[PDB]
């Protein structure tokens, strides 16, 4: 199937004392593999998946140098933005950055991204052409003219179509035992009476990977959204995910209702009904 590599960075200013709090995380698909936290003791990029631990000292020293340099860029940016938006030195503000690449089933480049936000709102983003910029307001328009003059999109395009995809392929190979394994959802249905004549049917999908999944209810073979509830996909904590969908039904009529589960690990979607 398709794969992705993504890095996420958050910096939160601390006007009271000291430097911003900085947290960086790296993912391959839905698997975290590296982290940096400015509050942690190591002051190094740290492994979070077994398959990245084999990387040598040059890798760890290099990623530590680069992630600390990213933290300093965010620190400077928080100051610049406070100036661009004419804000007080007294409040805490946040910058967020995400970048990475997607490859298809053949592991060839599909798309690249580099997005930045200030205080939880879009600031500037590289367009899908990897040449152009989306600036949300006039402060970001100032950044856009600066980054056009500094050949920034060229540098990002070279990384996104080159380094990013090359290293994603390396990680997919090194971590093949888990990264290239799909864990189909383990499904079951539960029944919870809500009165002496109606009940909730809850369709569960457990221990699946990757996180993408679709759960839908049908009644007599047509989609049912009335009297249904669908929770957000949630992490189990062991690297897999969970979700459920529920419907309220008249007791005795449970056989009319079917839950349909779609996932990359299922060659054909599953259909579940309540076991009377």
């Amino acid at each position: 199937g398709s794969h992705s590599m993504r890095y996420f960075f958050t910096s939160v200013s601390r006007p009271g004392r000291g430097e911003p709090r900085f947290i960086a995380v790296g993912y391959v698909d839905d698997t975290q593999f590296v982290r940096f936290d400015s509050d942690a003791a190591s002051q190094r990029m740290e492994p979070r998946a077994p398959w990245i631990e084999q990387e040598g000292p040059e890798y760890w020293d290099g990623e530590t140098r680069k992630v600390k340099a990213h933290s300093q860029t965010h620190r400077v940016d928080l100051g610049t933005l406070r100036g661009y938006y004419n804000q007080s030195e007294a409040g805490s503000h946040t910058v967020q950055r995400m970048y990475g690449c997607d490859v298809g089933s053949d592991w060839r480049f599909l798309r690249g991204y580099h997005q930045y936000a200030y205080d939880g709102k879009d600031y500037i983003a590289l367009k899908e052409d990897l040449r152009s910029w989306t600036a949300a307001d006039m402060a970001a328009q100032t950044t856009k003219h600066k980054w056009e003059a500094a050949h920034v999109a060229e540098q990002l395009r070279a990384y996104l179509e080159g380094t990013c995809v090359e290293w994603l392929r390396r990680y997919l190979e090194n971590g093949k035992e888990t990264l290239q394994r799909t864990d189909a959802p383990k499904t079951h249905m539960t029944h919870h009476a809500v009165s002496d004549h109606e009940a909730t049917l809850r369709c569960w999908a457990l221990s699946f990977y990757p996180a993408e999944i679709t759960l839908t209810w049908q009644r007599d073979g047509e989609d049912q959204t009335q009297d249904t509830e669908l929770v957000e996909t949630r992490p189990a904590g062991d690297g897999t995910f969970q979700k459920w969908v529920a419907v309220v039904v008249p007791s005795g009529q449970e056989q009319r209702y079917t839950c349909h589960v779609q996932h990359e690990g299922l060659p054909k979607p599953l259909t579940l009904r309540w076991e009377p």
């Binding site: 890095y7 790296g26 890798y59 990623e63 680069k66 992630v67 340099a69 990213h70 860029t73 400077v76 940016d77 610049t80 933005l81 970048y99 930045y116 600031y123 500037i124 950044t143 600066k146 980054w147 500094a150 920034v152 540098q155 990002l156 990384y159 380094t163 990013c164 290293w167």
Partner: peptide, 9 residues
């Protein structure tokens, strides 16, 4: 692998 030098805003 991370990007290297970033351009400030």
């Amino acid at each position: 692998l991370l990007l290297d030098r970033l351009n400030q805003l």
